[PDB]
Amino acid sequence: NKAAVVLCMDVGFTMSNSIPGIESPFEQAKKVITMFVQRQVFAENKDEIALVLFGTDGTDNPLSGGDQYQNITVHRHLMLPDFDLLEDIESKIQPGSQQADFLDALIVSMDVIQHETIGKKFEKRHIEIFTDLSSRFSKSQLDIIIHSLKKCDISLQFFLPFSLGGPFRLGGHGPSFPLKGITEQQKEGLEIVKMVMISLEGEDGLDEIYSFSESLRKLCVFKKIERHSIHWPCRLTIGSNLSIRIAAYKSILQERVKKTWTVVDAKTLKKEDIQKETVYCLNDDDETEVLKEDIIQGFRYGSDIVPFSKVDEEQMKYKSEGKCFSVLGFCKSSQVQRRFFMGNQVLKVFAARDDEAAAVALSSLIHALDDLDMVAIVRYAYDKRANPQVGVAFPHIKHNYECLVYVQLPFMEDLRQYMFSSLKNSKKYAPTEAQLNAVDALIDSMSLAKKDEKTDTLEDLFPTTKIPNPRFQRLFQCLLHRALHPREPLPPIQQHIWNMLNPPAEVTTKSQIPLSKIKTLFPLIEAKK
Amino acid sequence: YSGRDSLIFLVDASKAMFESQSEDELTPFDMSIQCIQSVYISKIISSDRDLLAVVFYGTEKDKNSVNFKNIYVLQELDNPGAKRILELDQFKGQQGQKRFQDMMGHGSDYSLSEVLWVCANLFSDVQFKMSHKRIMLFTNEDNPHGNDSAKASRARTKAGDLRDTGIFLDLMHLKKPGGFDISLFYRDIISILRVHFEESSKLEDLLRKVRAKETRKRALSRLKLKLNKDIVISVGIYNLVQKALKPPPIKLYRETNEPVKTKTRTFNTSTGGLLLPSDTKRSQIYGSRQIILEKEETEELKRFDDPGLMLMGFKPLVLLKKHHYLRPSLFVYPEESLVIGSSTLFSALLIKCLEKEVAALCRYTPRRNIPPYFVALVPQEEELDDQKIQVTPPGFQLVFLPFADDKRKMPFTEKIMATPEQVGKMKAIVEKLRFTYRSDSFENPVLQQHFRNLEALALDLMEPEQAVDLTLPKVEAMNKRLGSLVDEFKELVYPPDYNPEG
């Protein structure tokens, strides 16, 4: 629906400064808010956005009654964003000199929300604050603020110039700031906010406080303002005597740009003045024009082509009978390999909501299929006009719920066969022992998995699945550059985009020597490009 | 690209194939007729880009450019067509065979040297890149050249010469009541112990209609994976599974049936004059403001890295979510065209990663102005079946890693358990419904029906063949095998009044 989201940015001078070689926390915060607002505008979200600034040189808010909520200047009220907001963030936002308590800014922002959430409805009320915790704060309204947030259900997420939990890479892996340089003011603010949101949320409080650089490669900033995926209301069927209502969801789905490139004039810049047509003229007889409907489709048939209208096929088509999800059988999970998972999306299916009998049945099915290392074969049909397809249903159990996952499966027509040669039997390409050892050393120096201390758990040095696709970031960067500067060349790819693009440099340093071993031990020759 | 396949069909024009000991069964001539119809239909579906011919021997008359008596070419080497199918079907049946015997001779003597000469000439007429030269004979007697010793000698000499020239002769067993009598005159003469009173050697598959495009081996792209920046290795990328789609239609005229081409023009509105791509401006309106840009910036904003692969690191196969699937995977094989010696290193890395059970995650750039995704390269060890033929290629499986914005959020679902006896009921039901699945068990019935209709209308049949859909569950058999279990588990879970349907 609509999200009542407001941003409270500190215009303090303290984060206006930074260690040389590290961008200012004000500047990195500006980068994060610019990317957030560019996503907001370029996704054309119907969520109203407001901007409140505290620590400003002046003070501008309805709560300024004298010595109350000072250094707080409200920049934007709650409405839809615009390119004007982007240009104000880029230019009108400047590093100030004053500091103020962030609790006062929180109270002002929540009062603004209450004064502006009226007259409409909102699916969510949310706020994020960027701060370095180096500004003095009065821990007085913490209980009142917590109670008000609980009674009004406003979600919060916090981000820091330094890492929450040497090399420095903004928007990339590696340390963001050493943890031994935080002032005691920062430490006390950290403890206070820790206890505040631990009480507000529970144990997952520490999961919403993060750092700027890590948030540049993660959806945590948008993690509380998203939209749920619509369900597929249908019914699974077993035989002619069992059926359960279902609600399927496309858990994994490829993303596409929702704004096509409209064509306009080169002079008037109008699509109206530049419209389109197509012409079906005879290939012979001086290009005599065949009338638009006089054309009829045909089809290649071996060495011949037969005229064949669409009406004929639609009256002889193999019709699919509505939307149905019929199980076709069961096979062992070992009979299926990852190379046979077809389709461009993953259906993390579910039964009908609030159907406890369906929940019990699906849980029993999940247990039976899991204990037997067993999988099911099901047939899918989106609707009458859809194309029936075969797919695989395999269990997936989370710590809080069990589930079934559907992925479409191929037919014989989709299969192809390409013969190869047994490289393991290739006498002319047997690796030498020194080369094998160098390869092993390089693999050790290259692996992105470390066995965690005192545990059998395994960590990842590159969480790819939690990083978005970077087409949109550069797209919006160039779009805003053109909108603000429609006379200048496009801005190149920003460095943080490479930081998220590149793996940790420590792995590269480890691989430095084994890479030299590999290049010395392998006589690889090239060819002209 | 490699050579093509050439097929030759040579039926004896005699009395043996027009007669049978049991007329209820099919005459050898007529059954060969349905055989060639089926193989031509399969060829049309699969590899219509090859050459097929029809020729008869032993006929009273003759017609061939070689001008050998009793040798009559019926169809030259050509791509199959519905005209050929009908030209063959008019002789089909116990009346078409009588017609054939009416305006076409049969029963005269012949020379296998002569038929080898004419078939060699016909193969020599083909100037295209061939790879297979298969000749199928249709007779049930090894005697007719054993009668004349010199004839058998020259026939086997020419057969040896032909088989040495790359020509492959294969034997079609024909139903001889006295026995086909192999090993007497054939295995010493054919290119390769029951005397075969019957005919079915593999005629069952020959008559079996096959609906498959069976695209030949090709390379999608030979990308060149860079290790860090300079140690770069050529690799080949294939798709052993690839969605088969219906061929596009053909715009043609509804009064002459010839394909009419279409030309498309961008032009003015106020004037209507034809305009140029320079006159075209990319526009996108956001909110109320329109941003103007051109195409070149549009693809340059998609151009970050050169076409290739950039290693991200190594990760054990356990660290990937099973439900984490984005797009069908690819197969990666070593390539020694651009980088020579990469096969040795490919073997080394495959061995090492198989030992270490770690897949290789890389940044993938398919082509220019293309987005570099994240790809996991799982080792894929070669597997051989009982006959030691490769059922699993050796190499790597390249799967795709969806991004954070490539995953959608769902409403929260709670956990509701079930009694273990309901789990036992499910296990019993599954066991009553269990079987073994294979990838070659289920097809696309929609496409099969579309085909059957296409050939039916091409053959002008009064009715099309109905496609057999294996995706329709046999509800009666499933209910028969379940019986009590269904409503037992229903009463176990669903209240008697609360049916699954409200």
């Binding site: - | 396949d5 492959f168 294969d170 598959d205």
Partner: peptide, 23 residues
């Protein structure tokens, strides 16, 4: 050659679709 389609050289012999059995 065993396990090869006589219809199409260079391709495995095709068997009719087996459907499903019961154990």
């Amino acid at each position: 050659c065993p396990g090869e389609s006589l219809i199409n050289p260079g391709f495995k012999s095709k068997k009719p679709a087996g459907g499903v059995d019961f154990d």
